[PDB]
Structures are given as structure tokens and as C-alpha cells.
């Protein structure tokens, strides 16, 4: 689990074919080894050495588009004959400058500079892709960006000249001086829809696609349909069409933000993570706001009509004609989810694998079925801090069993398949994980490369064989399935034979095997933040809760995973009933309640929550007398059942909200406190108890002298304006006097 922590939040990341992993964090761009251990080299773009962000960037609402300083960062020409690869990096600084440079030692001279290539607005979108075009097949760079943002301050003037005001897509040339854009190599804009935010750019079937969506950077709300603009893969912009993408299924007003994109290459299927406006961070965060939608590139390629809806065309006016066709996703695959942030699709052993990154630090992968039907996603890796996953996942190019998860300011290299939990064949083959296969020589569920050391390929049994094709005992007893060796020995108890041979045992040269109608009203439901371990007692308040025999609660979190259907635990007062929810995965499940018979009554959202990890303990030491409200800062404290103080246990109260919570130190000594939730106990540092401090008094004004404890004003009560400092004793001054400290009251 090798991690690389930057200092400022990651702005971009790419992975070269053989030159390491480039990560653009703040003002500086680092290159690392594929193990993310040592920054082989580093470039400073703004000022030497000091690579702090010149200005402050507000990390906005997870649905809202982020902001960074490194707009473009993409390697190309790599794997050439003799020409070392190139890296094209474009920054916000210097009017959106962009430099080509040698892919490798970063501190080498930039070959060609260039200005106004990428958007110079830190929150403006930019997405680029290089390709081959021209009579001599030069390397061009198609860049779609938000050049003009209506936020120019008279100090510095980013927004390009009045001629290039409405420019969205430009076909730069990586050879010409300063990356020159032709006259016709640019795609104009319609000035009505607010701005456009481009998410991606990729090549498919001789064309470039730019998935975007209209957007109001001032307001923060999408102002139209997420769309895809399709351009001919040439030297001059040949606008070939534009098509809206309709992924608002399962949500009232629809999903109009495009959070991330990825083209599943060998499948010709685009895969996009859409979301609806989730208020301010998480206030309208519903169980169905985000949705992974899969589109057939053929349908987008066919349905995109050249209409002047968002981009100026030479044959119409802005929104004075047709409206763009709405392309419908592959219906059997759309995966709804409360918080999705990024997607990356690939194909392994002729099976689509879509890794997804959720807004709470989960990387979970789905494996599409036969007719591209999605399975319920397995959670691969979880970030302990639940930081929203950066919207791009990059697969390790040199070892195809890794992927580089970026989150906040930390990058890490995580395997793509958590197949160590499978202990048998069936566990390894019914899960239908394409990366994982059973291994006889090791008798373990593992990757391919980790067990193809014996040259007989059938040693590592994969899924394409089928789950039934592992060895088993057959009755006249024999071995069935696919074994590695053709020589074994059978022994039953007590006939034995050898080899393909004949309690039961089949032993091989490397392994072995052995076997011997009224109304119904719902006031509310509490709590609404159940920890992942479930909750034994969920109280639903309402009315007439006794006029029914079979009352059920149905929770649905993920449009692919099944539903949690439960019966009422013990029907209390006709106004109150009580349920018991089981363990699940971190999610925000919808809760309907269906009585004896009828439609579900959607009581409201109900969010499972990660276990409470304990960050810090504010005082961290108090007098053996105690009584000081120790404050604990952490995450997900609202779901805490209660607290334990183990040394003998001591029950103590709690006064808490989501992130932090306090409690009077009751020990009356190094004690360990533990959050208990649903019969489980997690640790929280250690509180130490020492003797009460000694005092000396003097004197409007009052001066006191005391010989570890971090005493502060609200801790002390002096009745007749405290200010203290250590001078060694330690003197504290305030302008029949009484002083209360914890539980000790004296003078």
C-alpha cells in the first residue's frame, strides 16, 4: 500500500508508458516511480522551490466542478522508435501557458512554449487530446476549455482578445511556434447558455468527442443537458455533431451534471458519471442523485446532429432550430447511487470491468454481465478519510493489476481485485472476477501473473473455463475439473490407487484434496445516520401503527444491489414502532415502509455511515479527579451508540454532533476510551490522569501560581477575565474569592 502525499490538492495526474507517473499538485509538477516512492524529478512552474498555490482555491461542493492550476497534462509520442516520448503540460499561469517538454527528466528545457493554450481561470474546464493529423501526420492537440469567464478583475486580464472571445475548442499544433491555432481550427460558442464545462476528450472511430455540460460558474448550477460534441479528427475543426445524453432516469428533475467520463476502449462504450445538483455539499444528497450511465458510442455517433444549439455553425443561429437528440443509455447497465465521483472502464478476458470512485473514498468495481448488465459492485478499497475521489482514475501501464487512486492530496497504487478472500474454487470462480483465477500449485485464488510460474497454463484456472470446472470428487471415484498434473494418488477409507488415479483423498505432486383500508401516517424515523454495523433499534413515529399485521420496511441503496426488506421488531404504541437494520455497505439508502399491503410509503433517506475513527483528544491529559470535558475530534461521531472508559469500566455521558464531541473525564492513570456501537468497540487514543496541581494565591487583580494539564479559561470559574502563562512556576491573573476547577472548588 504505497502512498504519495502531495502538499496541495492534486490538480492532475498522468501515467507515462515507461517514464513513471506525473502528478501536478500545486504550482509544482512532480514525476514519480510507478511505485509512488521517490519524486525522480520535479518542475516548478510559478516560482522556483516554493510551489504553494499562488492564490487560494475553494474546494467546492462535490458536484460542482473543482479548480486547479494544472489544466493540461498529457504524455504522447511515447513508445516511438527512437524518439523519446513527449509530455505536454499546460498551466493556468502565464495567460494559460502550455509547454511541450521531453517525457522524462523534468528539469530539462521545454522544447516549445505557447500562451493562451489552456483556460487561465483556475475553475475553468479544460480537456485535451493529441492525435495524428495533417499531410505529414504531425501531432496535433485538440483542447476544449473555458477560456472566457465573466470574472475578470481590472488587475489582471486573462480573458483573451475580443476576437477569440467565444472560443471553446481549438486544434493546436504541437510543432508550430507557440502551438499555433489555424483560423478555422477553432470552434466558436453560443453566448446564451452561460459557459460550457468540458469534462473529457477522447478519440473514437476517426473523431474527437468532448463530453461537456452547460454551467453557470457564478451560480453553480447546470443550465442544460449534459452533451457530447463530436468533431472530425482533422486539422481544421469540422463540427460533426452534438448530442445530449439523457441520464436523468430514477430522479425527479434529472441528472444534469457530468462528473466524470471514460471510454471503454475495446468495447466501444462510453461510460459517464452523472449527478444532480446536491444543494450545498450534502443537503439535497438523495439516494438517487448520481448515476453511472453507459452509452453505445455507435448511438452517439449516429444520433449527433449538427445543430447550432451550443456551438456556432455556419448554417443556423443560436438555438434557432432543432434541439439536439437525447441519446438513451444502455438501460440494462445504469447504476444509480447516492454519491459517485469517478469512473474508469476497461476490458479483461472479454468482460467489461468498470471501476468507480465514490464521494466517500471508496473504489468499488462492477463487472458487466452478458448483455452489459451491471452486477452489484464489490468494494475494492476504502480511503480511511472518506475524501472524495479525484475524478480521474489512471491504470498502471506497466503492471495491469494496479490503478492509481487519487484523492484530495494523496495518490496511491491499489490492486484492481481483492481476491484473497476467496479460499476455494467456487469462491474464486462464481464471483466472476476476470482478474482472479484459482491456482492449484498454490491452491489459492490469485491474479494470473502471481501464479503462472508453472509452465502448464491450466495451473491457473480462470473464469472463462467456468466455475464448475474445478477438481471435485466423482462417484468408482475419480477427479473432475481441471487439475494441473496428470499424476496423482487416490486413497479412500481404505483402497488406494495411483496414476488419473482409479474419508476420500486425491493427492497430487504439488497439492491435494480431501472430503469424507385505514389510513397510515408516518411522522418520522430516527436516527437517520445508522453506522455500517446496522442498528438494533430504529424508531418510526406516526399514527395508527397497530392497525396492521404484516408491516415491512424496504431499503434500497444501489439500483443494482438488492433490497433490505425487514419486519417490525416489536410494535409499540400505535404511534411508535421499532425496527432492526442489519450490516451493509456505506451508502445512503432510501427507506419505504409498506404496511399489510399497498404501495411503499417513502419515509425518507437513511444513510449508513463509516465506522467512527478517532482522530484526536483535545486535552489528552486531566487530573485524576477528572471532570474536565475532554473533547474528541474525529469523523462520523453522530452514529456513536455510547462510550466506554476502560482501565474497570466507567459509563460517562456524551454531548456530540457529527465531527466532534465532549464528555467529562470521570475517572476520579492512563485510561483507554472506546466507542461502542452495536456490540462493537473501537479505540480512541489514551487519556492520562495525574494528581491535582499545587497552588499559591495572591492579589483589582489576582495572581495565582501553579507548578501538563492544558487548563484554559472555560475550565476555571473565579467569582469575586483570566490570562495565564508558564514562567518557571506558572502564573495566571484575573482582573471571599471562589475558584472551581473540574470538580475541585476552593480558594
Ligand X SMILES: *[C@@H]1O[C@H](CO)[C@@H](O)[C@H](O)[C@H]1NC(C)=O
Contact track, ligand X, 145-184, x by CB under 6 A: -----x----------------------------------
The Cβ of residue 552 has, within 10 Å, a number of other Cβ atoms equal to 17
Q: Looking at beta carbons only, is 40 or 238 nearer to ligand X?
A: 40
Is residue 14 a contact partner of residue 8, using CB atoms and an 8 Å limit? no
Q: Looking at beta carbons only, is 572 or 600 nearer to ligand X?
A: 572
Task: Provide, rounded to whole angstroms, the least separation between the CB of residue 397 and ligand X.
Answer: 19
Task: Provide, rounded to whole angstroms, the least separation between the CB of residue 572 and ligand X.
Answer: 4
Gap between the terminal Cα atoms of the chain: 56
Q: Looking at beta carbons only, is 510 or 629 nearer to ligand X?
A: 629
Task: Provide, rounded to whole angstroms, the least separation between the CB of residue 498 and ligand X.
Answer: 56
Cα 48 off chain centre by = 32
Beta strands in 156-226 (DSSP E): 167-173, 181-188, 195-198, 202-203, 207-215
According to the 3-state scheme, what is the secondary structure of 533-597?
CCEEEEEEEEECCCCCCCCEEEEECCCCCCCEEEECCCCCCCCEEEEEECCCCCCEEEEEEECCC
Task: Provide, rounded to whole angstroms, the least separation between the CB of residue 443 and ligand X.
Answer: 43
Q: Looking at beta carbons only, is 541 or 559 nearer to ligand X?
A: 541
CA dist 392 and 14 (Å) reads 9
CA dist 679 and 146 (Å) reads 53
Beta bridge partners, 364, equal 356, 379
Of these, 79, 84, 107, 423, which contacts ligand X (CB under 6 A)? Answer: 107
- The order of strands in the sheet holding 290-296 is 257-264, 269-275, 290-296, 335-337
SS3 303: helix
Question: Which 210-239 residues touch ligand X, going by CB under 6 A?
Answer: 216, 218-219
Q: Looking at beta carbons only, is 93 or 695 nearer to ligand X?
A: 93
Task: Provide, rounded to whole angstroms, the least separation between the CB of residue 730 and ligand X.
Answer: 13
Q: Looking at beta carbons only, is 117 or 419 nearer to ligand X?
A: 117
Residue 432 sits in the site that holds ligand X (CB under 6 A): no
Of these, 205, 649, 670, 708, which contacts ligand X (CB under 6 A)? Answer: 205
Task: Provide, rounded to whole angstroms, the least separation between the CB of residue 595 and ligand X.
Answer: 18
* Residue 121, all three cell numbers: 481561470
The Cβ of residue 477 has, within 10 Å, a number of other Cβ atoms equal to 14
Question: Which 52-81 residues touch ligand X, going by CB under 6 A?
Answer: 52, 54
Alpha-carbon distances of 502 from 483, 490, 498, 505, rounded to whole Å: 15, 7, 7, 12
Q: Looking at beta carbons only, is 427 or 654 nearer to ligand X?
A: 654
Contact track, ligand X, 287-326, x by CB under 6 A: -----------x--x-------------------------
DSSP structure string for 74-109: EEESTT-SSSPPEEEEE-SHHHH-EEEEESS-SSS-
Residue 544 sits in the site that holds ligand X (CB under 6 A): no
Of these, 33, 42, 85, 110, which contacts ligand X (CB under 6 A)? Answer: 110
Question: Which 628-687 residues touch ligand X, going by CB under 6 A?
Answer: 629, 631, 655, 662, 664
CA dist 727 and 570 (Å) reads 63
* Residue 251, all three cell numbers: 430522479
Q: Looking at beta carbons only, is 43 or 368 nearer to ligand X?
A: 43
Task: Provide, rounded to whole angstroms, the least separation between the CB of residue 666 and ligand X.
Answer: 11
Size of the site for ligand X (CB under 6 A): 32
585-616 b/e with 16+ CB inside 10 Å = b?
bbbbbbbbbbbeeeeeeebebbbbbbbbbbee
Kindly indicate which of the ranges 107-115, 255-263, 456-464, 524-532 contains the residues binding ligand X, using the contact rule CB under 6 A.
107-115
Task: Provide, rounded to whole angstroms, the least separation between the CB of residue 715 and ligand X.
Answer: 8
Q: Looking at beta carbons only, is 107 or 646 nearer to ligand X?
A: 107
Task: Provide, rounded to whole angstroms, the least separation between the CB of residue 436 and ligand X.
Answer: 31
Of these, 5, 18, 105, 332, which contacts ligand X (CB under 6 A)? Answer: 105
Q: Determine if the peptide bond prior to 176 is cis (ω within 30°).
A: no
Task: Provide, rounded to whole angstroms, the least separation between the CB of residue 613 and ligand X.
Answer: 18
Beta strands in 613-678 (DSSP E): 614-617, 621-623, 629-634, 642-646, 655-656, 660-664, 670-677
Q: Looking at beta carbons only, is 395 or 693 nearer to ligand X?
A: 693
CA dist 231 and 143 (Å) reads 12
Is residue 230 a contact partner of residue 301, using CB atoms and an 8 Å limit? yes
Contact track, ligand X, 385-414, x by CB under 6 A: ------------------------------
Kindly indicate which of the ranges 39-47, 59-67, 418-426, 668-676 contains the residues binding ligand X, using the contact rule CB under 6 A.
39-47
Contact track, ligand X, 601-630, x by CB under 6 A: -----------------x-x--------x-
Task: Provide, rounded to whole angstroms, the least separation between the CB of residue 446 and ligand X.
Answer: 35
Q: Looking at beta carbons only, is 340 or 632 nearer to ligand X?
A: 632
Kindly indicate which of the ranges 47-55, 460-468, 495-503, 510-518 contains the residues binding ligand X, using the contact rule CB under 6 A.
47-55
Task: Provide, rounded to whole angstroms, the least separation between the CB of residue 560 and ligand X.
Answer: 27
Closest CA to 272 of 301, 302, 298, 246: 246
In sequence order, the 6+-apart residues with CB closer than 8 A to the CB of 56 are: none
Of these, 696, 712, 721, 723, which contacts ligand X (CB under 6 A)? Answer: 712
Residue 710 sits in the site that holds ligand X (CB under 6 A): yes
Of these, 33, 39, 60, 113, which contacts ligand X (CB under 6 A)? Answer: 113
Is residue 237 a contact partner of residue 186, using CB atoms and an 8 Å limit? yes
In the DSSP assignment, the letter for residue 468 is G
Q: Residue 205: how many CA atoms within 13 Å on its side-chain side?
A: 15
Q: Looking at beta carbons only, is 274 or 545 nearer to ligand X?
A: 545
Q: Looking at beta carbons only, is 492 or 543 nearer to ligand X?
A: 543
At 291, give phi and psi (nearest 5°): -155, 125
Question: Which 561-580 residues touch ligand X, going by CB under 6 A?
Answer: 572-573, 575-576
Task: Provide, rounded to whole angstroms, the least separation between the CB of residue 439 and ligand X.
Answer: 38
In sequence order, the 6+-apart residues with CB closer than 8 A to the CB of 163 are: none
Q: Looking at beta carbons only, is 162 or 475 nearer to ligand X?
A: 162
Q: Looking at beta carbons only, is 471 or 542 nearer to ligand X?
A: 542
Task: Provide, rounded to whole angstroms, the least separation between the CB of residue 218 and ligand X.
Answer: 4
Is residue 313 a contact partner of residue 306, using CB atoms and an 8 Å limit? yes
**Residues contributing to the site for ligand X (CB under 6 A):** 40-41, 47, 50, 52, 54, 99, 105, 107, 110, 113, 150, 194, 205, 216, 218-219, 298, 301, 572-573, 575-576, 618, 620, 629, 631, 655, 662, 664, 710, 712
Amino acid at each position: 500500500e504505497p502512498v504519495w502525499r502531495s502538499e496541495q490538492a492534486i490538480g492532475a495526474i498522468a501515467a507515462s508508458q515507461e517514464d513513471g507517473v506525473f502528478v501536478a499538485s500545486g504550482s509544482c509538477l512532480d514525476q514519480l516511480d510507478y511505485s509512488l516512492e521517490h519524486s525522480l524529478s520535479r518542475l516548478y512552474r510559478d516560482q522556483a522551490g516554493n510551489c504553494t498555490e499562488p492564490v487560494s482555491l475553494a474546494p467546492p461542493a462535490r458536484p460542482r466542478p473543482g479548480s486547479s492550476f494544472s489544466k493540461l497534462l498529457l504524455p504522447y509520442r511515447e513508445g516511438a522508435a527512437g524518439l523519446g516520448g513527449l509530455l505536454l503540460t499546460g498551466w493556468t499561469f502565464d495567460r494559460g501557458a502550455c509547454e511541450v517538454r521531453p517525457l522524462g527528466n523534468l528539469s530539462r528545457n521545454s522544447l516549445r512554449n505557447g500562451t493562451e493554450v489552456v483556460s487561465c481561470h483556475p475553475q475553468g474546464s479544460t480537456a485535451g487530446v493529441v492525435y495524428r493529423a495533417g499531410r505529414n501526420n504531425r501531432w496535433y492537440l485538440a483542447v476544449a476549455a473555458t477560456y472566457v469567464l465573466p470574472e475578470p478583475e481590472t488587475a489582471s486580464r486573462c480573458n483573451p482578445a475580443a476576437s477569440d472571445h467565444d472560443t471553446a475548442i481549438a486544434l493546436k499544433d504541437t510543432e508550430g511556434r507557440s502551438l499555433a491555432t489555424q483560423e478555422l481550427g477553432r470552434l466558436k460558442l453560443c453566448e446564451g447558455a452561460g459557459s460550457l464545462h468540458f469534462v473529457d476528450a477522447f478519440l473514437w472511430n476517426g473523431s474527437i468527442y468532448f463530453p461537456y455540460y452547460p454551467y453557470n460558474y457564478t451560480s453553480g448550477a447546470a443550465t442544460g443537458w449534459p452533451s457530447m460534441a463530436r468533431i472530425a479528427q482533422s486539422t481544421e475543426v469540422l463540427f460533426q455533431g452534438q448530442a445530449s445524453l439523457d441520464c436523468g432516469h430514477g430522479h425527479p428533475d434529472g441528472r444534469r451534471l457530468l462528473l466524470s467520463s471514460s471510454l471503454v476502449e475495446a468495447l466501444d462504450v462510453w461510460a459517464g458519471v452523472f449527478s444532480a445538483a446536491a444543494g450545498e455539499g450534502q443537503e439535497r444528497r438523495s439516494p438517487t442523485t448520481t448515476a453511472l450511465c453507459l452509452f453505445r458510442m455507435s448511438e452517439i455517433q449516429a444520433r449527433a446532429k449538427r445543430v447550432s444549439w451550443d456551438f456556432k455553425t455556419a448554417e443556423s443561429h443560436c438555438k434557432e432550430g432543432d434541439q439536439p437528440e437525447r441519446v438513451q443509455p444502455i438501460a440494462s447497465s445504469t447504476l444509480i447511487h447516492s454519491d459517485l465521483t469517478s469512473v474508469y472502464g476497461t476490458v479483461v478476458m472479454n468482460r467489461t470491468v468498470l471501476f468507480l470512485g465514490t464521494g466517500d473514498g471508496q473504489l468499488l468495481k462492477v463487472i458487466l454481465g452478458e448483455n452489459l448488465t451491471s452486477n452489484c459492485p464489490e468494494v475494492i478499497y476504502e480511503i480511511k478519510e472518506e475524501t472524495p475521489v479525484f475524478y480521474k482514475l489512471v491504470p498502471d501501464p506497466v503492471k495491469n493489476i494496479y490503478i492509481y487512486l487519487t484523492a484530495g492530496k494523496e495518490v496511491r497504487r491499489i490492486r484492481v481485485a481483492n481476491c484473497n478472500k476467496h479460499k476455494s474454487c467456487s469462491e474464486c470462480l462464481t464471483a466472476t472476477d476476470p482478474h482472479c483465477g484459482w491456482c492449484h500449485s498454490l491452491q489459492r485464488c490469485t491474479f494470473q501473473g502471481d501464479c503462472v510460474h508453472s509452465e502448464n497454463l491450466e495451473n491457473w484456472l480462470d473464469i472463462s473455463s467456468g466455475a464448475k470446472k474445478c477438481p471435485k470428487i466423482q462417484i468408482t471415484v475419480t477427479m473432475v475439473g481441471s487439475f494441473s498434473p496428470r499424476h496423482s494418488k487416490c486413497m479412500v477409507k481404505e483402497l488406494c490407487q495411483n496414476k488419473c488415479t482409479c474419508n476420500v483423498m486425491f493427492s497430487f505432486g504439488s497439492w491435494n484434496l480431501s472430503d469424507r383500508l385505514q389510513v397510515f401516517y408516518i411522522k418520522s424515523i430516527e436516527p437517520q445516520k445508522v453506522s455500517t454495523l446496522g442498528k438494533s433499534n430504529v424508531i418510526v413515529t406516526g399514527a395508527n401503527f397497530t392497525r396492521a399485521s404484516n408491516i415491512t420496511m424496504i431499503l434500497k441503496g444501489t439500483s443494482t444491489c438488492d433490497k433490505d426488506v425487514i419486519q417490525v421488531s416489536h410494535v409499540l404504541n400505535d404511534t411508535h414502532m421499532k425496527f432492526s437494520l442489519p450490516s451493509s455497505r456505506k451508502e445512503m439508502k432510501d427507506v419505504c415502509i409498506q404496511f399489510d399491503g399497498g404501495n411503499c410509503s417513502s419515509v425518507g433517506s437513511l444513510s449508513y455511515i463509516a465506522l467512527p475513527h478517532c482522530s484526536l483528544i483535545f486535552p489528552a491529559t486531566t487530573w485524576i479527579s477528572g471532570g474536565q470535558n475532554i473533547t474528541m475530534m474525529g469523523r462520523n461521531f453522530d452514529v456513536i451508540d455510547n462510550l466506554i472508559i476502560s482501565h474497570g469500566n466507567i459509563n460517562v455521558s456524551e454531548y456530540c454532533v457529527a465531527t466532534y464531541c465532549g464528555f467529562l473525564a470521570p475517572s476520579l492513570t492512563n485510561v483507554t476510551v472506546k466507542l461502542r456501537v452495536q456490540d462493537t468497540y473501537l479505540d480512541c487514543g489514551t487519556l492520562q490522569y495525574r494528581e491535582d496541581p499545587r497552588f499559591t494565591g495572591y492579589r483589582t487583580e489576582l495572581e495565582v501560581k501553579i507548578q501538563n494539564f492544558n487548563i484554559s479559561k472555560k475550565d476555571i470559574e473565579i467569582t469575586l477575565q483570566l490570562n495565564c502563562s508558564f514562567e518557571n512556576t506558572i502564573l495566571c491573573k484575573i482582573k471571599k474569592v471562589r475558584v472551581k476547577l473540574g470538580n475541585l472548588e476552593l480558594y
